[PDB]
Amino acid sequence: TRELQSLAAAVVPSAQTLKITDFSFSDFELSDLETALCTIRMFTDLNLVQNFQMKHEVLCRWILSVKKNYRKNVAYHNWRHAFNTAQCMFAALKAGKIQNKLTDLEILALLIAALSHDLDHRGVNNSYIQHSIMEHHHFDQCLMILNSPGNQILSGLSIEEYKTTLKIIKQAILATDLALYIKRRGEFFELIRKNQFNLEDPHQKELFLAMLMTACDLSAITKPWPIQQRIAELVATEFFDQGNKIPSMQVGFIDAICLQLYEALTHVSEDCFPLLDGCRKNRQKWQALAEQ
Numbered sequence: 001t002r003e004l005q006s007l008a009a010a011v012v013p014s015a016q017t018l019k020i021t022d023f024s025f026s027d028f029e030l031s032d033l034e035t036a037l038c039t040i041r042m043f044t045d046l047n048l049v050q051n052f053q054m055k056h057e058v059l060c061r062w063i064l065s066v067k068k069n070y071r072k073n074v075a076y077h078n079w080r081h082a083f084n085t086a087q088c089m090f091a092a093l094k095a096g097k098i099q100n101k102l103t104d105l106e107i108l109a110l111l112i113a114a115l116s117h118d119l120d121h122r123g124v125n126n127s128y129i130q131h132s133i134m135e136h137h138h139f140d141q142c143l144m145i146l147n148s149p150g151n152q153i154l155s156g157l158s159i160e161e162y163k164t165t166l167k168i169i170k171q172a173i174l175a176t177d178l179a180l181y182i183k184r185r186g187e188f189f190e191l192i193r194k195n196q197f198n199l200e201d202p203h204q205k206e207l208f209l210a211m212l213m214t215a216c217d218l219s220a221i222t223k224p225w226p227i228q229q230r231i232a233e234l235v236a237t238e239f240f241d242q243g244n245k246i247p248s249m250q251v252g253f254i255d256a257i258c259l260q261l262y263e264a265l266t267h268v269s270e271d272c273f274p275l276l277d278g279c280r281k282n283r284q285k286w287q288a289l290a291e292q
């Protein structure tokens, strides 16, 4: 309650002051409270606070409830990963101009899902406690926080808007299962290759939202080299130490997963090229170290 008091009373700096529009944004030098203020700015500059009548102390409490339900003792899948995932979603909407292709309810759901897509994660090698089981658990935690007293940032929505938002949130979180991405990316690419891609189709739009969440989920692979080098160390720490081969594994992950995804994202909106460009540069540096 003492952390909510300093957060709710603080001033929220501009988006340019917080550097949350750059695709190269990094959270390393930031406090936990500074990331919470950046998250408020993302809700603010997307007009989500205005268009849905969010009261300030409820958004502060919800943002705080979300970051506490991430586990500090997990190297990568923690609050900083969720905060960075939502930041790239903000950058892809603003700097990538994707914001105009979507509705307010879709933007509202994408930001909430990005912050919540990995809630209560305990590490990739600590999944024994238990068709995307983890993603279903992540949404259960997201819905529980959304319904917690004092944290209902969606109270200003009609019952019609509330369920449309809830179903987009659930599909966006489930899309972060790479298994689902692998089974659906083939369709996504095959319509890009024919210029048949049409976002007015509801099946098309849901597929694009699914690929967009994967793009920001793995957006650490697109960061500048000193940043990606450190994040890859965090990933390797969680997959090894339960809390060195890395260059080879980053190149394979870039070849099999990320390259085509960011290639397809730039075809949809050319201004998200810095994501594809940054991922190519990281593949170049990881490959050079793979050759010793």
Ligand SMILES: O=C(O)c1ccc2c(=O)[nH]c(Cc3cccc(Cl)c3)nc2c1
Residues within 6 Å of the ligand: 217, 218, 220, 221, 232, 235, 236, 239, 245, 246, 249, 250, 253
């Ligand atoms: O879970 C995520 O959201 C995520 C985000 C980024 C990456 C990434 O950059 N690489 C790899 C490959 C991988 C697997 C195991 C160990 C090592 Cl070192 C590398 N997996 C990632 C997974």
Ligand SMILES: [Mg+2]
Residues within 6 Å of the ligand: 117, 118, 176, 177
């Ligand atoms: Mg996940």
Ligand SMILES: [Zn+2]
Residues within 6 Å of the ligand: 081, 085, 117, 118, 176, 217
């Ligand atoms: Zn994730």
